[PDB]
Amino acid sequence: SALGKLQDVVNQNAQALNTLVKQLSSNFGAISSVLNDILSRLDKVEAEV
Amino acid sequence: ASVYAWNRKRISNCVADYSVLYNSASFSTFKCYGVSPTKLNDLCFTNVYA
Amino acid sequence: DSFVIRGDEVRQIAPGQTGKIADYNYKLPDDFTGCVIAWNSNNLDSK
C-alpha cells in the first residue's frame, strides 16, 4: 500500500470537500441551515439577522 | 376558559386562509414569531394547535 | 413629514413594520435617516 499516499491526497480532497458539504447542514446559531425556510417564513428586516 | 385551564383544539384538514383572520379589525394585539404575518396563508403547517 | 394618528398605532409608523398604517397609509423605509416626532393633540384634533 505504498500507492496509498496518492489515495491520501484523494481522501484529503474528498474529506475537505465532504466537510464543505457537511457544514451546509450546520446552521451557525441560526434557526435553520436552509435559507429557503427563512425566506419562506420571515419578512426580510427580521430575516437578515 | 381560564389560563391554567387552557383549552386546546387540534385543528386539522384545512384550506386555511389566515390573511382574513388578522385583517378582521376586532383583533387588537397580534404578533407572530417564526413566520411573518405576510406569508402565513401561502404555506402548509401540518396542524393548528390553538 | 406631518400627519394625524389616533394614538395607539404609533408603533406602526416605525421601519420594519406590518399592519394598517405601514402597508396602507404610510410606509417608512428601513434605511430611514432621521427621527419621528409624536405628541398628543387632543385639544387640537378632537372636539
Short mmCIF file of C-alpha atoms in Angstrom, two decimals:
data_model
loop_
_atom_site.label_atom_id
_atom_site.label_comp_id
_atom_site.label_asym_id
_atom_site.label_seq_id
_atom_site.Cartn_x
_atom_site.Cartn_y
_atom_site.Cartn_z
CA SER A 1 0.00 0.00 0.00
CA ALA A 2 2.82 2.33 -1.00
CA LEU A 3 0.48 3.82 -3.65
CA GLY A 4 -1.96 4.97 -0.98
CA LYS A 5 -0.26 8.32 -0.41
CA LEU A 6 -1.91 9.30 -3.70
CA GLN A 7 -5.10 7.99 -2.10
CA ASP A 8 -4.29 10.20 0.91
CA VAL A 9 -4.35 13.22 -1.43
CA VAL A 10 -7.64 11.92 -2.88
CA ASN A 11 -9.18 11.34 0.56
CA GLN A 12 -7.96 14.72 1.83
CA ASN A 13 -9.63 16.33 -1.21
CA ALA A 14 -12.83 14.34 -0.72
CA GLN A 15 -12.71 14.75 3.06
CA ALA A 16 -12.32 18.52 2.94
CA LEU A 17 -14.99 18.74 0.27
CA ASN A 18 -17.39 16.49 2.18
CA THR A 19 -16.68 18.73 5.15
CA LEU A 20 -17.78 21.62 2.94
CA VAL A 21 -20.84 19.53 2.13
CA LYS A 22 -21.28 18.79 5.82
CA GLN A 23 -21.21 22.30 7.27
CA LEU A 24 -24.01 23.35 4.96
CA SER A 25 -26.07 21.37 7.46
CA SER A 26 -24.51 23.49 10.21
CA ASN A 27 -26.77 26.42 10.95
CA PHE A 28 -24.12 28.52 12.83
CA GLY A 29 -26.57 29.56 15.53
CA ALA A 30 -29.42 30.32 13.16
CA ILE A 31 -32.93 28.92 13.21
CA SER A 32 -32.28 26.76 10.15
CA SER A 33 -29.46 25.67 7.93
CA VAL A 34 -31.85 26.01 5.00
CA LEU A 35 -32.16 29.59 3.75
CA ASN A 36 -35.44 28.94 1.93
CA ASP A 37 -37.10 28.10 5.26
CA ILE A 38 -36.22 31.62 6.42
CA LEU A 39 -37.22 33.14 3.09
CA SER A 40 -40.47 31.17 3.06
CA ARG A 41 -41.27 32.20 6.63
CA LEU A 42 -39.76 35.56 7.52
CA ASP A 43 -40.11 39.09 6.30
CA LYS A 44 -36.56 40.36 5.37
CA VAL A 45 -35.92 43.09 8.15
CA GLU A 46 -36.13 40.41 10.79
CA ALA A 47 -34.62 37.81 8.47
CA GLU A 48 -31.16 39.37 7.85
CA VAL A 49 -30.10 38.57 11.42
CA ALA B 1 -61.68 29.13 29.60
CA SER B 2 -59.11 30.12 32.21
CA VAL B 3 -55.37 30.39 31.66
CA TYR B 4 -54.27 27.38 33.72
CA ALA B 5 -57.34 25.51 32.42
CA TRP B 6 -56.48 26.40 28.81
CA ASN B 7 -58.46 24.63 26.14
CA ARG B 8 -56.61 23.13 23.21
CA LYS B 9 -58.09 22.33 19.83
CA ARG B 10 -56.16 20.30 17.28
CA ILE B 11 -57.41 21.86 14.06
CA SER B 12 -56.91 19.66 11.01
CA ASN B 13 -57.92 19.31 7.33
CA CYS B 14 -57.87 22.95 6.29
CA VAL B 15 -57.69 25.23 3.33
CA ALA B 16 -56.73 27.84 5.88
CA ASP B 17 -56.74 31.49 4.80
CA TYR B 18 -55.20 33.31 7.76
CA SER B 19 -54.96 36.59 5.85
CA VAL B 20 -58.63 37.32 6.54
CA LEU B 21 -58.14 36.42 10.21
CA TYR B 22 -55.91 39.29 11.35
CA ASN B 23 -57.44 41.68 8.80
CA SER B 24 -60.64 41.38 10.79
CA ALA B 25 -60.27 44.52 12.88
CA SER B 26 -61.73 43.13 16.12
CA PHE B 27 -58.37 41.50 16.92
CA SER B 28 -56.37 44.11 18.82
CA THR B 29 -52.97 42.63 19.69
CA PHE B 30 -51.42 40.43 17.01
CA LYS B 31 -47.90 39.12 16.60
CA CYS B 32 -46.18 36.06 15.16
CA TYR B 33 -42.75 34.67 15.87
CA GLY B 34 -41.17 32.33 13.33
CA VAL B 35 -43.32 33.15 10.31
CA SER B 36 -44.16 36.69 9.33
CA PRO B 37 -47.90 37.52 9.08
CA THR B 38 -47.45 38.43 5.38
CA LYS B 39 -46.80 34.89 4.21
CA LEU B 40 -48.94 32.72 6.51
CA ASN B 41 -51.60 31.52 4.04
CA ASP B 42 -49.06 30.79 1.26
CA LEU B 43 -47.71 27.77 3.14
CA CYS B 44 -48.58 24.45 4.75
CA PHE B 45 -48.34 23.98 8.52
CA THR B 46 -49.50 20.32 9.09
CA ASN B 47 -51.84 21.39 12.03
CA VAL B 48 -53.10 24.18 14.22
CA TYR B 49 -52.82 23.63 17.96
CA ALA B 50 -54.82 26.61 19.19
CA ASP C 1 -43.50 64.99 7.14
CA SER C 2 -46.52 65.63 9.37
CA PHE C 3 -49.86 63.82 9.80
CA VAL C 4 -52.51 62.78 12.35
CA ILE C 5 -52.58 59.43 14.21
CA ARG C 6 -55.21 58.03 16.62
CA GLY C 7 -52.53 57.27 19.20
CA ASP C 8 -52.14 53.53 19.90
CA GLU C 9 -50.98 52.51 16.43
CA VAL C 10 -47.89 54.70 16.96
CA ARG C 11 -45.58 51.67 16.68
CA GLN C 12 -46.75 51.13 13.07
CA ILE C 13 -45.02 54.28 11.69
CA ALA C 14 -41.57 52.76 12.57
CA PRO C 15 -39.49 50.94 9.91
CA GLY C 16 -39.75 47.19 9.61
CA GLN C 17 -43.47 47.20 10.41
CA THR C 18 -46.51 45.42 9.00
CA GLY C 19 -50.12 46.38 9.56
CA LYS C 20 -52.58 49.16 8.94
CA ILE C 21 -50.67 52.43 8.74
CA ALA C 22 -47.44 50.89 7.39
CA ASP C 23 -48.94 48.96 4.49
CA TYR C 24 -51.99 51.11 3.85
CA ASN C 25 -51.26 54.69 4.89
CA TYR C 26 -47.53 55.48 5.20
CA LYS C 27 -44.57 53.17 4.67
CA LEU C 28 -41.22 54.26 6.09
CA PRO C 29 -38.05 52.77 4.53
CA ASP C 30 -35.79 50.63 6.65
CA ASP C 31 -32.76 52.84 5.94
CA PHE C 32 -34.55 55.89 7.44
CA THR C 33 -32.18 58.79 8.10
CA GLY C 34 -33.79 60.71 10.90
CA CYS C 35 -36.45 60.83 13.52
CA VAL C 36 -40.14 60.52 14.31
CA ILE C 37 -41.82 63.18 16.45
CA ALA C 38 -45.13 62.48 18.15
CA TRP C 39 -47.23 64.41 20.64
CA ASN C 40 -50.82 64.22 21.81
CA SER C 41 -53.13 66.83 20.29
CA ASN C 42 -56.46 66.06 21.96
CA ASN C 43 -57.23 69.75 22.35
CA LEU C 44 -56.20 70.36 18.73
CA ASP C 45 -57.66 67.47 16.73
CA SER C 46 -60.56 66.21 18.86
CA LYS C 47 -63.75 68.03 19.76
#
